[PDB]
């Protein structure tokens, strides 16, 4: 007599069981391209069963399957999940050497950006509220999705999306969610003293200049803050440290390893308490003067447990606005230096004026570290034009929206023509055109 195993590979995004029956239209998301191997573990299971009870025997095999079977086995039948997450092992022996057969299921390959489902075993038979046994046994393995996201801007929450308009000086809270393996505390297969896992590296980075690393806000799992307990027992590094430029050359980022630090055994035990559960690693970065327009910068995140393999996920991109002006003489393209402006906006029937930080010495181009807005007009930063050729006043790090450039003082020898120049900042770009501004020469005597 024979038996079938239908697998229903599903996505997991939270903390979470196999009745053996079909659960029908569950309304959950499938996972295609996950290879599972099958192993008959009957003999090895029953040899364990002499000393240990059934739950203990199963636990023992769940961790360290490669101890009890050969995982790199050509003989072992492999099945890959299809577009609906379906995969079936057909035609297995319901009994093996006089006992009801016990089969194990190892996820051999696990697609991006998913962590593997636990190694599960099934001891036959599975029976119902009438004593009849199943012929086809439905299993619902769970691949935990690795995510990355931008969650807060200046400590305020924001609607999740793939492209965020920022302002220079903004603090951006990013997050990386991922699973703690169910076999984290396990020892290596065929080893008494060495551990299975000896690396648990999370590596976030931008390949472009926009951000500057601030901090590592929190680490949370099961609604518990871990970081406070963790810090000093794990290897940590940001792009602010000189160690970063040796191992990487990414402009921004950080690399945390739980099992790469001073006290890896201590952490492994803590990690085991929440084994299987999903952690979240929050970190902040600040938008610097090197964040420019016509630029979309995301970060990536590389979760890994060895140098050989890694799970890579991408978060949302960020861009910021800029604008150029060309202050000229009326009826020519002669550049006019030392024309004085201030930047204005409305804030609901109320006028505000821009104050720029980190802006001294700068004349033509302005590349501030922050911008704030005051109703006291005399406190606004007075902008000066250069003698530059195609554009002699540029400003960056603005949010998209509507502004007004207000000429406070014309350059000497000239009178103001258009005192108030209304203009729109376009999302993530320098804008449609460089905005020309004429000035009338007064032929003085």
Author numbering: 37 to 52, 55 to 483
Could you give the paper's own sentences about this structure?
So-called major pilins polymerize head-to-tail into the pilus backbone, with ancillary pilins added at the tip (adhesin) and base (anchor). The L. rhamnosus GG genome also carries the genes for another pilus operon called spaFED9.
To study the effect of lysine and catalytic glutamate or aspartate on isopeptide bond formation and structural stability, alanine-substituted mutants were prepared. X-ray diffraction data were collected for two mutant proteins (D242A in the M-domain and K365A in the C-domain), and though no isopeptide bonds were present in each, their overall tertiary structures remain unchanged. For the M-domain, continuous electron density shows the formation of a trans isopeptide bond between Lys186 and Asn337, with a catalytic Asp242 lying nearby. A cluster of 12 hydrophobic residues surround this isopeptide bond. Functionally, the K–N isopeptide bond probably brings stability to the M-domain by covalently connecting the two β-sheets of the CnaA fold.
